[PDB]
């Protein structure tokens, strides 16, 4: 009852450590449980455990949905002291987004050794903002407005959600309702080259074609788009776009072993192809719990 609620949280944390287990990554319960307990009302509701390759190999993020009725979750973590305010405009962006747009749901993100680091803001699927609307939010990075011509020339306009990286001080604009030309190899290569990012080979370009979402990463320091990521959702455990045998086995092992609760359906996976000025890396998130969406 009340012990059922305490168990849900325990049950979640046990899945985290097990997902970290598949990675040789250690979980810090003292940094994690206080965060999961603050949102135990919701954990009783989307839960994702995500990994990365290369420089981010020794880390496991998690992502928990927070309904708007709970209220701005960044405000919650700052009152409860689970995270120090940055003194940066990112402090304002989450509450500023809901002040300006109908937000359909929040989410929080933390790393198993770091604790809290990100919020999300899900817009309604029927009422998605565009680039213009988003850049009128006064604490958006100016780089959202300074890149509105590029976004339109690549057919990126409808935004499904944003993410706030408080530790990194960045915003990801998750572009949705993508037209197939945006995803064709000619456009992807033209986009990455115009941005000075890593140029995906034929495997990346065939991966990019599956993308259901494309998200650039924008900061407040400059206009330059820091990084760009292609997101594919699939039951396929084999889709990681890397020719390296360690990667192929790493991401295949997690896609087939990661913890999930809603058995009756195959694991929902969300791969990412992230491009950067000097490298590309790969991401994978396995949903522990999922709702009708």
The first and second tokens of residue 2, run together, are 């009340």
Which residues are bridge partners to 269 per DSSP? 234, 286
Contact between residue 160 and residue 122 where contact means Cβ atoms under 8 Å apart: yes
Q: Using alpha carbons only, how large is the chain's radius of gyration in Å? A: 18
Q: Are strands 170-175 and 159-165 parallel, antiparallel or unpaired?
A: antiparallel
Contact between residue 9 and residue 43 where contact means Cβ atoms under 8 Å apart: yes
What is d(CA 150, CA 166) in angstroms, rounded to the nearest whole number?
A: 26
Contact between residue 232 and residue 239 where contact means Cβ atoms under 8 Å apart: yes
Q: Distance of alpha carbon 184 from its chain centroid, rounded? A: 23
What is residue 57's DSSP assignment?
T
Contact between residue 174 and residue 159 where contact means Cβ atoms under 8 Å apart: yes
In degrees, rounded to 5, the angle at the alpha carbon of residue 34 between the alpha carbons of residues 169 and 78 is 40
Residue 179, CA atoms < 13 Å, CB-side half-sphere: 11
Which of 214, 39, 274 has the alpha carbon at shortest distance from 13? 39
What is d(CA 161, CA 277) in angstroms, rounded to the nearest whole number?
A: 24
| Domain coordinates in residue numbering, the chain | 1-293
Contact between residue 228 and residue 215 where contact means Cβ atoms under 8 Å apart: yes
Contact between residue 74 and residue 119 where contact means Cβ atoms under 8 Å apart: yes
Contacts of residue 190, Cβ cutoff 8 Å, sequence gap at least 6: none
H-helix segments, the chain: 2-21, 29-38, 40-43, 73-79, 90-100, 131-135, 142-145, 148-153, 180-183, 185-195, 202-208, 245-257
What is d(CA 226, CA 237) in angstroms, rounded to the nearest whole number?
A: 29
Contact between residue 60 and residue 49 where contact means Cβ atoms under 8 Å apart: yes
What is d(CA 164, CA 73) in angstroms, rounded to the nearest whole number?
A: 12
Q: What is the resolution of this structure in A?
A: 2.5
H-helix segments, 125-244: 131-135, 142-145, 148-153, 180-183, 185-195, 202-208
61 is annotated as contributing to ligand binding: yes
Q: Which residue has the tokens 């449980």?
A: 33
Q: Distance of alpha carbon 4 from its chain centroid, rounded? A: 29
């Amino acid at each position: 009852g009340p012990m059922s609620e305490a168990a849900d949280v325990e049950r979640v944390y046990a899945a985290m450590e097990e997902a970290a287990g598949l990675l040789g990554v250690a979980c810090a319960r003292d940094k994690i449980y206080p965060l999961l307990s603050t949102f135990q009302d919701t954990l009783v509701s989307v839960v994702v455990f995500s990994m990365a390759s290369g420089r981010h190999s020794t880390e496991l993020d998690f992502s928990i949905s927070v309904p708007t009725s709970h209220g701005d979750p960044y405000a919650t973590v700052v009152e409860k002291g689970l995270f120090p305010a940055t003194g940066h405009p990112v402090d304002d962006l989450l509450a500023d987004t809901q002040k300006h747009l109908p937000v359909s749901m929040f989410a929080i993100d933390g790393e198993v050794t770091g604790g809290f680091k990100k919020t999300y803001a899900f817009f309604p699927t029927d009422n998605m903002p565009g680039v213009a609307e988003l850049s009128a939010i006064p604490s958006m990075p100016p780089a959202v407005a300074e890149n509105a011509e590029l976004f339109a020339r690549y057919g990126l306009d409808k935004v499904q959600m944003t993410s706030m990286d408080y530790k990194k001080r960045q915003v990801n604009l998750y572009f949705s309702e993508l037209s197939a030309q945006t995803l064709e190899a000619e456009s992807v290569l033209a986009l990455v080259r115009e941005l000075g990012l890593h140029v995906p080979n034929e495997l990346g370009l065939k991966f990019c074609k599956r993308s259901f979402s494309v998200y650039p990463t924008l900061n407040w320091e400059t206009g330059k788009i820091d990084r760009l990521c292609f997101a594919v959702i699939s039951n396929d455990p084999t889709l990681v776009p890397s020719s390296d045998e360690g990667d192929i086995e790493k991401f295949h092992n997690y896609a087939t072993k990661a913890p999930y609760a809603y058995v009756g359906e195959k694991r929902t996976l969300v791969y990412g192809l992230t491009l950067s000025p000097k490298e590309e890396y790969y991401k994978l998130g396995a949903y522990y719990h999922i709702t009708d969406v």
